[PDB]
Amino acid sequence: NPEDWFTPDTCAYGDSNTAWTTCTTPGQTCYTCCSSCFDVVGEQACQMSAQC
């Protein structure tokens, strides 16, 4: 679940919500943020949910 998979050690975000939602919206970092803000478990779950 996308609170759990959050890796703030490398995500410039303090909220797993704001993080996931960045990764699933057009910004500077949509789909790729799934990789650079979540563990591999959250990555695939985000990269399958991430539509810019």
From Swiss-Prot:
Its main location: secreted. It is found in: Secreted. The keyword Glycoprotein does not apply. Disulfide bonds join C11-C37, C23-C33, C30-C52, C34-C46. One of its GO terms (cellular component) is extracellular region. Keywords: Disulfide bond, Pheromone, Secreted. The keyword Disulfide bond applies. One of its GO terms (molecular function) is pheromone activity. This is Mating pheromone En-1. Mating ciliate pheromones (or gamones) are diffusible extracellular communication signals that distinguish different intraspecific classes of cells commonly referred to as 'mating types'. They prepare the latter for conjugation by changing their cell surface properties. It comes from the Eukaryota.
